[PDB]
Design a protein around this ligand. Structure first.
Ligand code: SPH
Ligand code: SPH
Lengths: 58, 245, 297, 242, 49, 242, 49, 99, 58
């Protein structure tokens, strides 16, 4: 089970579970990702965040 | 408060009284390149206050039948001041930006502007009308300079991509009823730690009027639009003689 | 040595990226909480301000009276692997007995995935991608029958000598990877790594590769990204004489181990050219369907 | 030496099959990944972003394609007049095709969740008015007048220093998921209607324009989910792309 | 050589043997020869109910 | 007895595939290995050895093939004259083809690292002089004169009891790796230029020769690396080798 | 690489055979099951009516 | 003149920054360079001819018959390795026949 | 897992990881080598080594 660390997703925060039979790590299966989202990075990219209950402009 | 703001950097200052907060591109501030991500070996230069300042490029007129304009970065600054000198003398380049758009009118004027930042904004051609011709945009269209360029088909943004989905990009609205300015802060966007400042353009800035300007006869008919911008955390490397283009 | 206050207290050199947002796990859809009526002044979640550039954040519980729903709907199917790890056609190579396209029994196919709309529209939703690949070669005659023929596929990285004929010396493949397979066999399948000199493939490149005067002849350089030129794929029929059957080869690509950056609007016009976002100027059509009036369905 | 028995399903090529394949290049190590901003991990992140909705999809010629992005309001006779109507299906043909949410939902057969619509008023500062925005749950025909339309879910919008309002389309359905319906007998998964009625009037003083335009923006909520990935309906190619 | 394709509701139905829907960028498909053993695939529960 | 299902990719022969094969000779034991000096474990060991660089690749006939290995210096008018120019691509056609580093890099598409060039002066003991050796980073045209050429990376060379000097070509690039460029639009991975200018003069006393020759040696540094092994461009066979 | 020997009974399709097949749709999750009354687990339950 | 490569580095000649180099050297090893298959011999079995008219042939084993392999293997003077031979057979038109 | 010790790289300083199914050890895969270099043996084969900062001939 000693193989090269040469997949496209090495040096990433999330870890997969995959099956490999060769010494090169990019030959493995796609596997399962981890379910994490950051919707604010596109939906609410403001400097000073404001609460729902108030008026955005005051 | 929130409607009033003052932006100061270097030896310049911008005040406003009808702000609408500040948009930070992709929720990230501009930053320098780290030692684990840099690939070139020579020591880069960081001129600091002499290049990180607000530059006012030009003024455009908003009319009832205007279609829109776009500007390319950092092509607008490749020939302005110390920043332009450094960009000409050096091979590599890395920086973010802070964009401020000025447009003011009265309480009896109406209209809306969409100000957006689209990275790698490649401009497509009309392909000779019928579409059997293999044309490419000329120099004045791909790299208009600091004078900008006018859109011909704003519904497709001259690339076959709908404007209704341009809001997925970092953006702000200029609605004359509410605000009179917009600010977007863009970090460095690229797949390379450093890139050429003359061959490569990182992003493009779009200003398209979605709601037409309208006012009653007698009010002021000349409504200008102004672009102001400041590089942030600039680096340069690979020093040689200057090259014009 | 730093002695002046403006250098001692300077903030130059901060290489860490200040992140305003953080990622939170979300295996299922969000639950709904119980809500009741509210009759008060000063606190209004219905009114927003779209000028700021932020999506409105009023929820169900703040606008209407709702019940409690324990949402257990998974979000697993919309991930990048689940969306992209499906095979699709990207290229065809034709090997006719007589013709002008490939008359010699060999062909060279430059590897690019912008040749077919189904795959191109999916891949061009983003600006940068970094992934692994899985190629499959399905070969058959124009009538679709399978015949006893031996073929050779060769991967030619950029800088290697391209074969010029069926008897070229490049087919000795002392270093290039190659595949010998028969048409009676199952399709050939190989795995390809990430090969870019950069950290990602970019499908849009606003620039030129070289300096100089940008005249008419030196105009096609716009949008041409050298980092997406991944070489050539060469095919031939093994033998010293001409083959007996005309063959057609279809190539299917399946992505895996995917990462993507910078989403952009989807294409709404018909494609015309490869690596070229041109569109038919005189035949612009709306994104969607139309109706007679705004007050009727 | 180890006895085996081949089962049905050998020698076939399934396009969606997750498998292992032989690597062409041994010991190859890729270029390291630098930090690139704006990374996407799930399509639901992109589904929650406001994009312009084309309620006014009447015009078709190129010289007038741009006013499909907004619709007008003007002074009326104060009798609860009707302004516009549109349906609430995101993946169906109609107004929703101009949104990123609609384009992405065109790739999935089944969806579930509540939607949101935001309207931005772009009149002069001196113009006031009120409007009634109604959502009619599935099963009912189009309301004939404002009195009938109030009986659904609705919000009263008042023009002021806040230009925008949010209309939330709640998830009201008999099934946990909605398959994609279209013309014919499959419309049993209809979503409902949205209509905008005048509440009082569009009042303007002397010296300000008589007509103002409204821009609508659409998105999905945090309980929205999609399922059963498929190919999109429209193919953007007529011949050979070359 | 045959091709089977699974078309979920809402997808474009092929209209001819040279239709563009056969690019199967998203639809699952099976390429198999008659000389091979029969094709066998597993299908989940797909009802909205 | 154990049920199995054959997958796509059976019965194919992949030349680079790492596999197991049946041994023809059972229980065969090889000849023991004695200690042989000069063992190689990595090509980067051979890439760090100085070999002569052919800056003067003008001559082509057999009677004059040997002066491609050096180029001359002589007394001038003291105006900063130009001596020679060459590019910095090791795997590209040109001067670098005569080096072991260049020949080995012809086998790999992508490289990364800094290079080094060493110049050896073979004049008489009584001859003095100074020279300016410049490296122009990518993007700029060829310098027109010494004043323009000094603006790049350069070293001032002084003749003395030490015959040689080292010019180090630093790794200045936008990408982590450089693919192999050639004539056409792929030159966007250009490396730069090296030019040698007179600094003062080539001064010689009475009784010593007026012309002296210079030999250049090339190698790579300790951060040099190669990638994506491929076949070499030139094939050293015209017919059947027999 | 692992030596194997095919046994009699390969390439046949037995209708009652309990086996494993490749799934067409990856990561597909079905609609949750609500409580429906009157569930049958064995035919002998129906035989006693 | 001594016969040694010059050992001046980057840090001694120009002003440099700190780069954390993480580029692997795994691909230039002897196995990575040489463990690739290539053509070394051809045997022809014609129906009529003067080369192999009887339906049998003898091929003396030597790998200096083809330039691609010969140039790679002759970079060195001594080698000690194991081998893996593969025999691909077809007719001149390239079809596969029951023989 | 009892096999002959008859590969070409026996009696060597470096160790590999390989896969074998037969009793002869030369039938295994190529595997992964160890990453060690001795560049001085070709680049600096002098008797008395000299520092970078000084003059090689004094
Ligand atoms: C013997 C093996 C033969 C099979 C050769 C297949 C190798 C494929 C090369 C890598 C493909 C990379 C995927 C696409 C990369 C670029 O972005 C595209 N060219 C876009 O134009
Ligand atoms: C039934 C098995 C038939 C296959 C026979 C293949 C055996 C090959 C014999 C060993 C080859 C050794 C590799 C080359 C050794 C010598 O250096 C070359 N002849 C160089 O001329």
């Amino acid at each position: 089970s000693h193989e090269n660390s040469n997949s496209a997703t090495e040096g990433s925060t999330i870890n997969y579970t995959t099956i490999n039979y060769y010494k090169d790590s990019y030959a493995a299966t796609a596997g399962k990702q981890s379910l994490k989202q950051d919707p604010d990075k596109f939906a609410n990219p403001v400097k000073d965040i404001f609460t729902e209950m108030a008026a955005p402009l005051k | 408060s929130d409607r009033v703001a003052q932006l100061t950097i270097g030896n310049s200052t911008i005040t406003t009284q009808e702000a609408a907060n500040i948009i930070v591109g992709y929720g990230e501030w501009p930053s320098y390149c780290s030692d684990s991500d840099a690939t070139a070996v020579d020591k880069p230069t960081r001129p600091d206050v002499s290049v990180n300042r607000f530059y006012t490029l030009d003024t455009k007129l908003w009319e009832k039948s205007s279609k829109g304009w776009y500007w390319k970065f950092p092509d607008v600054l490749t020939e302005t001041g110390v920043f332009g000198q450094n960009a000409q003398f050096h091979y590599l380049y890395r920086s973010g930006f802070c964009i401020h758009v000025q447009c003011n009118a009265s309480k009896f004027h109406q209209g809306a502007l969409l100000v957006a930042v689209l990275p790698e904004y490649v401009i497509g051609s009309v392909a000779g009308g019928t579409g059997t011709e293999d044309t490419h945009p000329p120099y004045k269209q791909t790299q208009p300079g600091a004078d900008g360029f006018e859109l011909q088909h704003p519904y497709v943004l001259d690339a076959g991509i709908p404007i209704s989905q341009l809001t997925v990009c970092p953006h702000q609205w200029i609605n004359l009823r509410t605000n009179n300015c917009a600010t977007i802060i863009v970090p460095y966007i690229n797949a390379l730690p450093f890139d050429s400042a003359l061959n490569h353009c990182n992003f493009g800035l779009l200003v398209v009027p979605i709601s037409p300007l309208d006012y009653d006869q007698g009010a002021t008919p000349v409504i200008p639009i102004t672009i102001t911008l400041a590089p942030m955390c600039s680096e340069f490397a690979g020093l040689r003689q200057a090259v014009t283009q | 040595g730093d002695r002046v206050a403006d250098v001692i207290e300077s903030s130059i050199g901060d290489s860490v990226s200040r992140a305003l947002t953080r990622a939170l796990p979300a295996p299922t859809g969000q639950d709904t909480q119980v809500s009741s009526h509210r009759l008060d002044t000063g606190k209004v979640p219905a009114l927003q301000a779209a000028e700021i550039g932020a999506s409105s954040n009023a929820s169900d519980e703040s606008m209407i009276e709702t019940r409690c729903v324990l949402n257990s709907h998974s979000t697993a199917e919309t991930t990048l692997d689940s969306f992209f790890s499906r095979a699709g056609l990207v290229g065809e190579i034709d090997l006719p007995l007589e013709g002008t396209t490939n008359p010699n029994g060999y062909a060279n196919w430059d590897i690019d995935i912008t040749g077919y709309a189904q795959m191109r529209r999916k891949v061009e939703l983003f600006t940068y991608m970094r992934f692994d690949a899985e190629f499959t070669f399905v070969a058959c005659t124009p009538t679709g029958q399978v015949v006893p023929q031996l073929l050779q596929y060769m991967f030619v990285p950029p800088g290697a000598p391209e074969p010029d004929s069926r008897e070229s010396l490049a087919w000795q493949t002392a270093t290039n990877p190659s595949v010998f397979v028969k048409l009676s066999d199952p399709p050939a399948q190989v795995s390809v790594p990430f090969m870019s000199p950069a950290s990602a493939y970019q499908w849009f490149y606003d620039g030129y590769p070289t300096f100089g005067e940008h005249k008419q002849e030196k105009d096609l350089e716009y949008g041409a990204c050298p980092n997406n030129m991944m070489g050539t794929f060469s095919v031939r029929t093994v033998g010293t004489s001409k083959s007996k059957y005309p063959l057609v080869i279809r190539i299917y690509m399946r992505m895996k181990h995917v990462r993507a950056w910078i989403p952009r609007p989807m294409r709404n016009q018909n494609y015309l050219f490869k690596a070229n976002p041109n569109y038919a100027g005189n035949f612009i059509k709306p994104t969607g369907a139309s109706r007679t009036a705004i007050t009727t369905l | 030496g180890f006895p085996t028995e081949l089962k049905p399903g050998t020698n076939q090529f399934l396009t969606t099959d997750d498998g292992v394949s032989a690597p062409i290049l041994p010991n190859f190590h890729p270029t390291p990944c630098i930090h690139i901003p704006g990374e996407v991990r799930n399509l639901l992140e992109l589904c929650q972003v406001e994009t312009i909705l084309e309620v006014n999809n009447v015009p078709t010629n190129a010289t007038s394609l741009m006013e499909r992005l907004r619709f007008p309001v003007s002074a009326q006779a104060g009798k609860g007049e009707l302004c516009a109507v549109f349906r609430a299906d995101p993946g169906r043909s109609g107004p929703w095709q101009s949104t990123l949410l609609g384009q992405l939902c065109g790739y999935y057969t089944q969806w579930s969740g509540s939607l949101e619509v935001t309207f931005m008023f772009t009149g002069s500062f001196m113009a006031t008015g009120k409007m009634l925005i109604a959502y009619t749950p599935p099963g009912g025909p189009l309301p004939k007048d404002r009195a009938t339309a109030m009986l659904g879910t609705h919000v009263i919008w008042d023009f002021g220093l806040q230009s925008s309002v949010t209309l939330v389309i709640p998830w009201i359905s008999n099934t946990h998921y909605r398959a994609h319906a279209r013309d014919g007998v499959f419309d049993y998964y209809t979503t409902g209607l949205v209509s905008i009625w005048y509440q009082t009037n569009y009042v303007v003083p002397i010296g300000a324009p008589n007509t103002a335009y409204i821009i609508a923006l659409a998105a999905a909520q945090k309980n929205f989910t999609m399922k059963l990935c498929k190919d999109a309906s429209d193919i953007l190619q007529t011949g050979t792309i070359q």
